Amino acid sequence: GHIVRAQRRGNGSVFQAHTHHRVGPAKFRALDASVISGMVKEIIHDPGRGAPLAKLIYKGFDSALVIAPEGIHTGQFIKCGAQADLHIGNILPLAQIPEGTEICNVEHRPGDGGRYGRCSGDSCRVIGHTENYTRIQLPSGRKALVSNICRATLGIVAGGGRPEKPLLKAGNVHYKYKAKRHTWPVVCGIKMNPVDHRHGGGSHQHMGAPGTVARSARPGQKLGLIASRRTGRRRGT
Amino acid sequence: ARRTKKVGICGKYGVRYGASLRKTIKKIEISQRKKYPCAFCGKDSVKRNAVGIWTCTKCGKAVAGGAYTPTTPAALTARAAYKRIREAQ
Amino acid sequence: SLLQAGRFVVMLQGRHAGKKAVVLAAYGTEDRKFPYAIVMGIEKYPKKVTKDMPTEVLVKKTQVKLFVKAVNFNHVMLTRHNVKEDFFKKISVEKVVAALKDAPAKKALLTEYAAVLRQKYLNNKMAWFFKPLQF
Amino acid sequence: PKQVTTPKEFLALAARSDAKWVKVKKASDDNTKFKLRTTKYLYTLSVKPKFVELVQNSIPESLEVIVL
Amino acid sequence: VDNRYTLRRSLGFHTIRNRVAPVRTPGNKLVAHYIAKRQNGPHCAETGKRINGIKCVKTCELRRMKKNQRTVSRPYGGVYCGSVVKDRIINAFMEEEARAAQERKMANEQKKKGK
RNA sequence: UUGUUACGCGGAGAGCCCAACUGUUUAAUAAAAACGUAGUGUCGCGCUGUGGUAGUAUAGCCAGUGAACGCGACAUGAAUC
RNA sequence: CGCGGCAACGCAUACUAUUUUUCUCCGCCAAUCUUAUACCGUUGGUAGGGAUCUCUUUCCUACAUGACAGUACUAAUACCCAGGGAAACUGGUCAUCAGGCGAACUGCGGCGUUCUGCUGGCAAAACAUAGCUGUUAUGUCAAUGGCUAUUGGAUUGGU
């Protein structure tokens, strides 16, 4: 057999991110001990990422490409800190914020940059305050103990509802993955011959083998549904 | 004269792509081109610049909105949530 | 009503924009058909001075340069502050001639009233006026 | 190559100790052009036949004069 | 007649730097003359508009020109146009005046306790 | 009675099958019904992680200038029923 | 050895450093207007050559000015300033439109980019006729359109 397209993404020659026109890494300023006001100089769109970024100035002018909540405008004053009040814009630690509210770009570790809840039209919800660890629900469903000192932007991330509209033409998806990375178009494994992929070969196109494989299964062998505790139509539940 | 009976903005696509998809995009393509009322300078000339971004021309300003309308319903709910908690206490 | 003589202003646009001023004669004329008021002002402010190197470096930073101009009401920003006697009247007694023309005639005023207005900085009065503002 | 209007200003440019030659040259409409050479530029002077005779005399004696 | 003309420079291709225009010589011969590049010249920060009172030439040959024609006379002469400078005066006055009146306020308010 | 004079310029219609469509393909016997696609669906994983790669230096490389409206793994193949 | 204009801005002014901003400087597609070059044109003309049984005041060639530097008023569109203070809504594009966050409109406003004319470069050169044995003669003129194209630029729109 040959090495399979799933294995070949590691070696990373043509399968690298197209990172040329990307404006910078989206994160907070570092922590550095109250309250600090910060004007939104402008809000710009970087390629690949569906969200906007908003370039702040903590005037020297110290810059920070923070990811943009919805309802931010140019020449708003954003207020990072503990004793900053509640507006959509402001960047509070999880000690201060009320529970049962939608927050954006929340950090895992303090002073980190921002980790959970970054893509367009997403938000971490806050469940409740234990003592040190403010428990929050992530967009998927999963729940996470996160320390109260670490920061999070208030409100929902901008650019919501982009997949509501379908892309009618193959050309629209060509321009989508030009900004991101080469991973498209996908040739299906059944169509390929036996050497190229596991599902390939045979007189008539069909999978033949069970098509559902363990965590223990090797490189080359992990193809199709990996460790699928259910399959088929998820009716109810 | 009106010249298409049914189709509207999706007449550019012609016979392609199915009836159900052109109904769906008819709603969204009308939205993203439409000029919307500005908060700041007041005037009705807020166009879409990029995906999330909505530049007003005459202001010279921008706002972060939705993808295809400047107001997302879910983001508009978040204002009302932080209003009632700030107005309390 | 607001534009009296005894009032400070700030210049909004022009060459001297930002810089301080006081009104003299708030007036239509046939020369120029709009509202206009003849003003004093100051071009270069006296900077702060440590007492190391006496006399020579002081008498530079001492000296305060002036200007006079016949400015529109739109291009001046009015202020809280007023002047508080005969001295205010003396500086504005003669000024239209300098404004009208002849550089030597106008330079006779600005050399004179530089020396008069500087002696008020000696006393630490009009402390707002001789101080600048940062943009 | 600049032109110079006034005959007085021409004679200021002539007496600089830059200039190597002047060239006299007949022209259309019975005019003539005095082309002063300088290191940088070539200063031309158009004149009418009223004041043609006086200007040549006006020119410095030392500077060489090439007739065409 | 044949009015066709060669490129003189040894670059073949039609880039932005290698562009030509046909011109009649003194000798009745058509010939390539090369186009010098366009310049936008100084726009302003804030809004993004053309300032007046300066040519759009190259900034290198802006140095060769007189110091007069490089600038506008006011404070923030090149960078900011007129009405944006007016706004900076009004705000930076009244930000400082409110802060100065705050020092007058906290002087005046605390004196009520003594009397 | 001939005339878009030469030159240049669609024969048309009525059934049935396959793939929806623009596109890609066995350089040198196969251009297709094959591949592709939008659309639909299933599975894995909240970063001390997941899918790779790399090789003795406790090397650091790819997705990642990334964070579930996301990244990766498959299957079906526009719409309508 | 710092002055003019109410203002937009104009005119003769240094250097080191720090920070901030601009020019360099940016996709593709579509439309309108306009220099330059080419070409076709209405009006004439003069130089030479071709053609002729008959006809053709004919046919052909020629009618041109570089980088660079200057300052006139004509006349444009962009943007800004002063006055002005708008529904009986007015102004404007090929098209969308613009305006009390200040429109129409008036200034022999300001300024940028293009434009027409007049020069310098500049006829001394170059080219075409005519004659003399290398050079002397005349001449290269006057009027004014493009519904044609390409190029540079301007004013915009769409995606």
TrEMBL record, chain B:
UniProt feature coiled coil, ranges: none
GO biological process: translation
GO cellular component, one term: cytosolic ribosome
Keyword Signal: no
Disulfide bond entries: 41-59
Gene Ontology MF terms: structural constituent of ribosome
Keywords, comma-separated and alphabetical: Ribonucleoprotein, Ribosomal protein
Family the UniProt entry places it in: Belongs to the eukaryotic ribosomal protein eL43 family.
Name of this protein: 60S ribosomal protein L37a
Biological source species: Trichomonas vaginalis (strain ATCC PRA-98 / G3)
TrEMBL record, chain C:
A Gene Ontology molecular function term of the record: structural constituent of ribosome
Presence of keyword Cell membrane: no
Highest taxon in the source lineage: Eukaryota
InterPro entries in the cross-refs: Ribosomal_eL27, Ribosomal_eL27_KOW, Ribosomal_eL27_sf, Translation_prot_SH3-like_sf
A Gene Ontology cellular-component term: cytosolic large ribosomal subunit
CDD domains with a match to the protein in the record: KOW_RPL27
Gene Ontology terms describing biological process: translation
SUPFAM superfamilies per UniProt: Translation proteins SH3-like domain
UniProt-listed Pfam families: Ribosomal_L27e
UniProtKB keywords: Ribonucleoprotein, Ribosomal protein
Similarity remark: Belongs to the eukaryotic ribosomal protein eL27 family.
Name the record gives this protein: Ribosomal protein L27e, putative
Organism: Trichomonas vaginalis (strain ATCC PRA-98 / G3)
Highest classification ranks of the organism: Eukaryota, Metamonada, Parabasalia, Trichomonadida, Trichomonadidae
From TrEMBL, chain D:
Gene Ontology CC annotation, any one: cytosolic large ribosomal subunit
TM annotation in the entry: none
Keyword Ribosomal protein: yes
GO MF annotations in UniProt: structural constituent of ribosome
Alphabetically ordered keywords of this record: Ribonucleoprotein, Ribosomal protein
InterPro entries, sorted: Ribosomal_eL38, Ribosomal_eL38_sf
One biological process term in Gene Ontology: translation
Family: Belongs to the eukaryotic ribosomal protein eL38 family.
Protein name (record): Ribosomal protein L38e, putative
Source species of the chain: Trichomonas vaginalis (strain ATCC PRA-98 / G3)
UniProtKB/TrEMBL annotation, chain E:
GO cellular component labels: cytosolic large ribosomal subunit
A Pfam family the protein falls into: Ribosomal_L34e
GO biological process: ribosome biogenesis; translation
Keywords from the UniProt entry: Ribonucleoprotein, Ribosomal protein
Alphabetical list of InterPro entries matching this protein: Ribosomal_eL34, Ribosomal_eL34_C_sf
UniProt GO MF annotations: structural constituent of ribosome
Keyword set includes Ribosomal protein: yes
Domain of life: Eukaryota
Family under the similarity heading: Belongs to the eukaryotic ribosomal protein eL34 family.
PANTHER family: 60S RIBOSOMAL PROTEIN L34
Protein name: Ribosomal protein L34e, putative
Species the sequence originates in: Trichomonas vaginalis (strain ATCC PRA-98 / G3)
